[PDB]
Design a protein around this nucleic acid. Sequence first.
DNA 1: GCAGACACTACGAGTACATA
DNA 2: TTTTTATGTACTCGTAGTGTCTGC
Lengths: 319, 320, 319, 314, 186, 228, 228
Amino acid sequence: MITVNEKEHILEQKYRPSTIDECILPAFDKETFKSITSKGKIPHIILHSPSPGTGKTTVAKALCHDVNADMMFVNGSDCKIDFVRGPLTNFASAASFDGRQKVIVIDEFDRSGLAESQRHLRSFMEAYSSNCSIIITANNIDGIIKPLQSRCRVITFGQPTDEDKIEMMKQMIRRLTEICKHEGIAIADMKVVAALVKKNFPDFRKTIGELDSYSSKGVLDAGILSLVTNDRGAIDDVLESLKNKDVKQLRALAPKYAADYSWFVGKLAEEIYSRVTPQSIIRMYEIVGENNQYHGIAANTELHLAYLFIQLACEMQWK
Amino acid sequence: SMITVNEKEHILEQKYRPSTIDECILPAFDKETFKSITSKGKIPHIILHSPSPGTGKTTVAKALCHDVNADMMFVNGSDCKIDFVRGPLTNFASAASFDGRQKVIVIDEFDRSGLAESQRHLRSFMEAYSSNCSIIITANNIDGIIKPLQSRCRVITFGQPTDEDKIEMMKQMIRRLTEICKHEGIAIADMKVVAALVKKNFPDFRKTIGELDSYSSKGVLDAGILSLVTNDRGAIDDVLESLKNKDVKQLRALAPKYAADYSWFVGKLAEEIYSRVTPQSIIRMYEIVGENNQYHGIAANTELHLAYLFIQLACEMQWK
Amino acid sequence: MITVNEKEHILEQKYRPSTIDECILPAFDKETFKSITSKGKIPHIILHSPSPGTGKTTVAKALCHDVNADMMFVNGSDCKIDFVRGPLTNFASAASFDGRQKVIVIDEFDRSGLAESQRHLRSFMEAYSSNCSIIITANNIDGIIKPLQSRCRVITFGQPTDEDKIEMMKQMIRRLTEICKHEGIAIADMKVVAALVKKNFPDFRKTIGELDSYSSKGVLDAGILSLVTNDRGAIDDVLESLKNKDVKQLRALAPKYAADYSWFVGKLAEEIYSRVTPQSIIRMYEIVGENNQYHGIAANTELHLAYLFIQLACEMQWK
Amino acid sequence: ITVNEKEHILEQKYRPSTIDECILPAFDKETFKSITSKGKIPHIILHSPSPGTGKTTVAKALCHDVNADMMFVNGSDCKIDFVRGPLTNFASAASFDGRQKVIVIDEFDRSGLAESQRHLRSFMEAYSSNCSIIITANNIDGIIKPLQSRCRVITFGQPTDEDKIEMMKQMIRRLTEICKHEGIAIADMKVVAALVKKNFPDFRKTIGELDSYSSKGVLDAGILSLVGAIDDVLESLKNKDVKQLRALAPKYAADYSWFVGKLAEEIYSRVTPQSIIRMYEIVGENNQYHGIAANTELHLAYLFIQLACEMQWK
Amino acid sequence: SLFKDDIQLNEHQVAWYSKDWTAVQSAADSFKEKAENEFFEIIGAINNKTKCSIAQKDYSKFMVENALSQFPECMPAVYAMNLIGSGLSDEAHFNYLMAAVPRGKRYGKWAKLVEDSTEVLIIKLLAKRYQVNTNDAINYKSILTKNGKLPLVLKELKGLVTDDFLKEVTKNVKEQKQLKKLALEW
Amino acid sequence: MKLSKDTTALLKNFATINSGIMLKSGQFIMTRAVNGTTYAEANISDVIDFDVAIYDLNGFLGILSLVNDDAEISQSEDGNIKIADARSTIFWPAADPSTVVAPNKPIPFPVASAVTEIKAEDLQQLLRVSRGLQIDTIAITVKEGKIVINGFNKVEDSALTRVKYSLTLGDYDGENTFNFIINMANMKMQPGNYKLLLWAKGKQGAAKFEGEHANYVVALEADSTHDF
Amino acid sequence: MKLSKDTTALLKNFATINSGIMLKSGQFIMTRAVNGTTYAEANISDVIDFDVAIYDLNGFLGILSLVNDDAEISQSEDGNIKIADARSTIFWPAADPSTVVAPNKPIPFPVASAVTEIKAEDLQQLLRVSRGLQIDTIAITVKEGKIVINGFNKVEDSALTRVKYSLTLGDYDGENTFNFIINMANMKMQPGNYKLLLWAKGKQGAAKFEGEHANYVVALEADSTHDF
DNA sequence: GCAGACACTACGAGTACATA
DNA sequence: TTTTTATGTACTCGTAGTGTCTGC
Ligand SMILES: Nc1ncnc2c1ncn2[C@@H]1O[C@H](COP(=O)(O)OP(=O)(O)O)[C@@H](O)[C@H]1O
Ligand SMILES: [Mg+2]
Ligand SMILES: [Mg+2]
Ligand SMILES: [Mg+2]
Ligand SMILES: [Mg+2]
């Protein structure tokens, strides 16, 4: 039911799905993939999603596995113009004495510096389409030229509906539970698995990585739940001091965060954005932009951050 | 003495580099995860990052390889161009070790934009050779690592301790600096110096050791070194008394005195006025002084700048 | 004792100190340099000060001299990343058959376009730290990335104590007397030399330059003293034009006092404090302080002074 | 009087070649002649906020009176790869006839040359034994402080009363000689005196107006009234043409420092007094916040919007 | 084609099967359609208050600010982001511009100056010859026009117009015409 | 001390393994790739008379090609490398020993798990066919009594199942079954006849080539199989 | 008139010094770098009969290279220049002489204070070694009675301390001591033999190379030392 | 034994980023 | 509904020129 590759020790690489049915996809995407595998022949496909770890490479290999195709997996970054002139032509023109459809998987082909090669590939597709098909995967769809996008079926991963998201998260919870059972990880509180799934969605690779990381002591109990539901870089003290207009605590907190000024200012803007009025958003971004613009200009940096704190505490209207 | 010493190095922070995880001063959760990794015998793909320098990312990257006894290839991340990955790195990852050890690639400081394309070539590489070889990346700016590579690695953020974690880490760094002074021959006539050095440069332990070497030019850490470390350049009695009296002329005369060391003066002035003024005046004092200090590096006449600050404060403060 | 480079005709370049003792430095900084030389090994150093002519380059070369180091002097504006991959790596990887330490002096290394190069350095400085050390000298410490600042001993020049300032001015007066002895300049009044030293502090380069300037006749009489005190006359014309709200003369006088804007705003506050009614002092300080604190970002200085004059003429009440 | 028959512009044809030929204040000319008498030339910054006083001419005259192998570089052309290339080759190599080598960088404050100046920081000390640099600037604040430390800053002009009358005499004599040489007839010497007075001390503007009038052959009312360089912006402001102002912003985004002052100067005459004050306030705030702005085009566009909406032309 | 039969192949098949890589290069350049952009889907969100997440889209502070700078209703926000927003995040820039820019359907064509390529070339020539700035070159052009010496000066400078200089003048390949325009400059 | 052309060709072949080398006084030279894939040792006619580390071996051999063949190599008074020619002299820098990755001691190869021999003609044919069929990996395995080298192209054939080349060395009288995969990139040796030793112990393994002048140790690919 | 291919190859070398060139009536050509760090002269066979200023010399020589060798070159009636050859005719714009940097006066090189010679093979070896050893400056001095050229890498050796290359040029016989420094960037000469005349007096001096085609004079570096 | 083949470098085109 | 600021710096790809060694 689950696919285990004993050669791999990394958890996300050990449990890579091998069939289209095993992958956790949106309903319509899985339906189209099942249709592709059922009709027997694979068209030219481009699986793309900027969000990593949604299942593009997995689904490409699973299509090749369901069709039982003669797959040539290729690192897209190595698919330069000489690769198309050479290995791709050698593989397309080779005679097949077993009826297996030839499919070329070009994994992560979204490099701009390969545009010329991609153009060649397009011409290639007009000469060897009757011999083989191509399954490109990519993160930046704009890294694929427009003729390639037009000639292929472009499937956008990581763009689900709300009900699709609910169903996918339930399926991922079940899959992580099965992985725990296979790995000897005792689940004392399923809320840990639910929190991991909801936190790292839609990056399933990162979800299994988080599972491996937090399942160190072999038990998923309330302690691991409190560790997962936490934020190790949370700024809450500064936010609560600003909400209370506490000048003493802001004065005390200025040197704590004054060391990493740029990162702290970015995270503070990011956190205040969701907790204030729209006009407060305008004012906060103006204040923060000015204070950061005069970063290297001011003399006392801790004083500069305390000045930013006073400004924000005075002008913010917390919802 | 359970402190590693590179006899080939003379720079203090290079000489006293920890060689194992237990020697590294790390937050509780981070050191626990690192001990767990070393216990599991195999190393996954890791990214050790922090905007703060000198937190131990490269040290821990080498110590993991040491504890696991991994065949490590330590590579300058800025030389790790795409042709280097296509060449020696692929051969290293695909080949086996002569003694059956796990191969690990440590790409130190991999957070340049100019390497993004190279990093792109990596995102298939890391999945093709994950059975035999792993990749440990060091970074200052995590955004210099493309999001797929972050997805492929366990990301560990240095310099993020709890309050109790920070207290314990400072205690441990104080003990380590005392042992290092013992080894090096630096007399510690006042432990307050070491405590202030640790508190001042946290969480940069490299800068901590470097400033320990700086303030130990006289071979002793006496009270003068403490006054230098905490920056104790005297008192501001004249300015404060002239501000309370609204003595505009005296403030105009006093501006050039403190114009020289402006940052220290403005910090001390904020600290002193904070206590001797009404709460309504505290906010306005922070506003005035913050604006003045913000526009420092731009003000053409720093003495006139301090006069402007003095006039604003003398007019708008309510001296409790 | 004084070092003389006979190949140099410019006075500030002819008498460059070649040892640490010949330098005029604060007590603790000179003590630190003497300690570094007595140990025999130079660490990674960053000598910086926004005030030019404090001696960073001089002290770098003097450290390399006193330690007897194999020095490679490099203009930092040329130290690109390929310059580190090539020349710097060749220099650092070369052996030291004579036991000398290899030191790379990267002079004026605070350009933003070198950031990437600086980044490439933060591993370099740790690979070759056993035999090779780097001495960066900068005017803006913000041009050095934080990891490089972490890897170095940061030494800020031009920020002495009062006793340090007194001693440095004494030493500078004596050095100027020695330089005038060597160069053939007659000092008819030591108050002229003291005036030069106290005026141009802590830029000693400009001190020697102005010594060269005012000694055109070969003698330093008391008539040069009134020229050195830099009082630049009075400002009665602008004050009367402001009292009369005469815009045309204010536009005419803007380029005049655009010569030394800092001195002009200082003199303007100092003088106009007495010529406006007491009710206008706070507003006039607001106007002048703003015009002065925004000067470093004002593209046109003459227009900035015209704007100041218009504000003052419009808002001031006169006695 | 120095003449260059190969030149077709009068200000390029009749450029003074020595310090004595230059019409300068007494103190300034005395200091220049003392510098030339010193034998060698140190790094010098000629600064003149008032235009047309002749900082380029004085730099070339210094090079000529000290007898130096001079390379004249326009500041805007002095990009960093030019400093690394030909300028380094010139400064490191000695002259065939043993003269001191000098680089003249004209109007170094004009454009994005800050990186070239920060490069010049070490360049000037690396080759000081053989090569000196003469930088000219209208706004001394445009030159970074390390260069000001490395150079001797000579601020121009501010003549006395006797200096002013003597310089006007010398300029009237020079204009008379140039008119005799070019074949232009002087109908009234009072007109020449009035022109010199009107444009004092902008001698370059005087010679430029003379060259503009040259086609007639005589001098009558060159003082004119009607019959600019900002005519498009001024007209589009009067018409409240926001779209044309938006299109014009990138054109003058090149040299904001010059354009903004020229705009204030041209607006000062054509608008009402309270609008003169208002224009000075608006333009001054815009110039004041210029160093923060990232795209000067948008900054200039916003200035145009404000001025167009608030100006009461006469 | 001696063989008068054949269903006949397309140009791509003939290029690839023959392995004539120049024909392959031409067939690939056949697909050299260039310039793809969807920046105006972001600006619309700023203008129409649509929901839009840039966590997965490419962002350009210059393009967004210059697009919004075409209409005076947005110039306050563009001005503010041009002053203090340079050190902000792209997400923060976009968030501020959505919160501040007032709602409105304002899409139109950008205001672009139409230039006399010949006059630009003349000004660049005069600036190169006399080593002056651009406005000094325009003043020289005015003086030489109202003197009649401009044909003489243009004649003396006609040799300075190298084919690399025309690249700086104008990228339109019709620059060849100006070349002939400068060849006939007498 | 001169350098016979055989010595210089050997040094070039060694430079293909490591950009720099650390040669000490004697007649024994060695090098190891920085990524620890190939190692080489050799004895040569010319006698090294002073320890010195070369950071750029290729450039050193270039400047050697730039002078007469009878040039005299010595240690300069400053401590560098002095190449004395007829009218000219070249001073080449001596690198810091720590800045060159070199073996600490000559690694002794263990007792072999299998032994065979490769004739120089078979090796040359293998290399030329590798240029031809573009095979990038080889597998030393057993084929019904004999020891064979199978040559695969891992780009178009990732599972190493479609054999593009096959060579038969000697027969194998043992009882073990093995399949040692070797990447063609790590075959950095010069032509000649080689006794091929193969060692494997569970996770550990290596392939040694003993020639009449040089020995080459090569690391096997991670997914090699054996039952030793 | 036509330009023989030797004249064209010479002009291509003269374009390496100055992007343009001014040709005046005679059988003699010359050019100098715009910064005045190097100047070249050459007596040429083909007769120049009319003065013509070429601003773009490389594009002009590209025009020349295309249309045969017997191409008739002259000036056109309108005012430009014309290149006619059987099948085609090309018009090239004649630049004003003020638009091209010309040395104006043929520098009469004084009687040399030192004379030597250098063969084509020695110069080729020196350029090859400098390309190998990263050498960027040379110093001509007198060592142990002979005249030597020492090649230094001024980047890693700002003071010219460690000699990286050395070459001998023969005995000196004189009674003076000198050290003429020459930056390699200023030597745009074509391969061949060269008679080297080094002249110096006070602060001025130069180094002239008389070749088999052209003479190249170059300026010494700032800190050159002599006792003439 | 010398065309041809193999490899190496120099340069144009395209992309990207920081800062003004 | 439209659509690109200057300068400096860094990287990758493709190809053409160029040098150098060698196979029937
Ligand atoms: N002091 C002066 N005496 C005579 N002519 C002058 C003087 N100053 C400027 N000029 C005229 O101005 C022209 C060049 O001016 P320039 O040196 O460029 O002034 P600026 O650099 O201030 O614009 C010359 O042709 C010259 O005739
Ligand atoms: Mg993938
Ligand atoms: Mg590190
Ligand atoms: Mg300096
Ligand atoms: Mg000028």
